[PDB]
């Protein structure tokens, strides 16, 4: 018989529901009461990067805060100079159905993948200058949902096969896999130290992983529905999430629970993407509402809106130095804001 394991699991959950309530001496909304709110964040479009044919489905900033990758389902990955709006590279992908791209912290490599189940790594700084595939990381049994480089020889990927994996780029194989999620793993973000990462999935949960122990360390469950986006708060001790729930939620790695929730009665559609400003003070979120809301991260007031898109906001990223946010969309344009 199995049921002793179900009894043990249920009592372990009962213990941790109680342990989280024993930590719940306050709320962020209570201790925030004396904080002076942010002014109305009247940001405006400073560039419009145009040239993609289809819907833009992902983007990522370089650590230099100049360069951008973005990917669209016409099968181009384009590299842009954000200051001059020059196209530095345009890369023909072998499959059209790209769903993620990422750009190395050195600027040497870009990665992307999607419905082909493969992560393709491109070397930008090859001798002949004409860019080409370095390696293809085959081994996931479902489409790639996210990619992040830890360094020029380590990448973490998440997949529709319900797993994450860590790879060695020189070997071209998985050196760890992460398997506690159920349903499709949607989104993924490294901690600032790159020793932890979080992932969110269609099980309506987020999980915290150690990169080298290879195991889940905490699980978070506050969403009533499917999680599309996740991001670390800049201190590394907390993270935000966004979902088909029409809510953002913020969690802390030591309180082990929802610390805050962001919602308004005017919004009922899914959240596609999230990010923080450099101090963590603002949470920026993209929607199926064709626009981005900007939230006071401590108060959960809407501090502003970015309204410049004609179709679903697919991706959103603040620069590594905080000097801008770029937002992509199914309208095929990238807009940069201050």
């Amino acid at each position: 018989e199995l049921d002793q394991l179900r009894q043990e699991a249920e009592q372990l959950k009962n213990q941790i529901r109680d342990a989280r309530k024993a930590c719940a001496d306050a709320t962020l909304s209570q201790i925030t009461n004396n904080i002076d709110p942010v002014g109305r964040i009247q940001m405006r479009t400073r560039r419009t990067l145009r040239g993609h044919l289809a819907k833009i489905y992902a983007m990522h900033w370089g650590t230099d805060s100049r360069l951008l990758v973005s990917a669209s389902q016409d099968g181009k990955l384009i590299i842009w100079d954000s200051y001059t709006t020059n196209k530095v590279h345009a890369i023909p992908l072998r499959s059209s159905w790209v769903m993620t791209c990422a750009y190395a912290p050195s600027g040497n490599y870009v990665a992307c993948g999607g419905l082909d189940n493969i992560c393709s790594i491109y070397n930008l700084k090859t001798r002949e200058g004409n860019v080409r595939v370095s390696r293809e990381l085959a081994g996931h049994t479902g489409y790639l949902s996210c990619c992040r480089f830890l360094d020029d020889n380590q990448i973490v990927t998440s997949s529709g096969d319900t797993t994450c994996a860590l790879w060695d780029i020189e070997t071209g194989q998985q050196t760890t896999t992460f398997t506690g999620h159920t349903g499709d793993v949607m989104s993924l973000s490294l901690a600032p130290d790159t020793r932890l990462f979080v992932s969110g999935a269609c099980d309506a949960s987020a999980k915290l992983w150690d990169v080298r122990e290879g195991m889940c360390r905490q699980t978070f469950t506050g969403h009533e529905s499917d999680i599309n986006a996740i991001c670390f708060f800049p201190n590394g001790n907390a993270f935000a999430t966004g979902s088909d729930d029409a809510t953002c939620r913020l969690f802390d790695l030591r309180a082990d629970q929802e610390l805050m929730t962001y919602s308004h009665d005017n919004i009922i559609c899914g959240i596609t993407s999230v990010s923080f400003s450099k101090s963590g003070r603002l949470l920026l979120a993209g929607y199926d509402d064709f626009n981005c809301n900007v939230w006071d991260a401590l108060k959960a007031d809407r501090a502003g809106v970015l309204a410049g898109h004609d179709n679903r906001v697919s991706c959103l990223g603040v620069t590594d130095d905080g000097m801008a946010v770029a937002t992509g969309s199914w309208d095929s344009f990238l807009k940069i804001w201050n």
């Binding site: 389902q73 159905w97 189940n117 096969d161």
Partner: protein, 238 residues
Amino acid sequence: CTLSAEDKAAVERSKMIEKQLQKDKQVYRATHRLLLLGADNSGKSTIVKQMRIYHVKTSGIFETKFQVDKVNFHMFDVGAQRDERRKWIQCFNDVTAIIFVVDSSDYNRLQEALNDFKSIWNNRWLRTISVILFLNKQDLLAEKVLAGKSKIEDYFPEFARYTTPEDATPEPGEDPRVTRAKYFIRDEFLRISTASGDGRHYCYPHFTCSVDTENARRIFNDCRDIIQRMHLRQYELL
């Protein structure tokens, strides 16, 4: 202008990349993208092989080029994914059509195919995508009816009520039982498709066997009708 040799090289590089993008935009308009769907029994695998006269295995999508009357089609078969469709399907918000394949000979499986069609048809992200139905293995449907086994009513009790549309066009020498059966199952997908979507998308049924060399011609004819109805709606003539 104020360009250094470096800024000149960056602008020249940009204009060369823009020249390449502007050329590839012609190819992207000159081709039609099709998503091919259907269960394990459907025979979609034999349809796609038989189309290649018009032209790693663990990868999560397969692609087939074909052309008819100098129009290009790219047909995508999603395979080696998990069975939960609800997320990856959002990529196909902008295909010309979905091709949906059914094994008409499996009365046990046919309600799964109707449920699978219903969740495709009513999907939030597919509100403007028309479906081409291939009601496949019509030879095996003829065999299972002509064998006299007389059992469709065990699965579908309205087949005791149903009688053939006067709009029906049976082929020469087709039996009235075979004809009543093939039009009955067709009209179940018409029951689903005509109930929703207010002329923003349409369903195009065909009776077929996977060996039909006519299947690429059927896709061409329906894509032509799909684009005509789409233009006719912009001008409020539908």
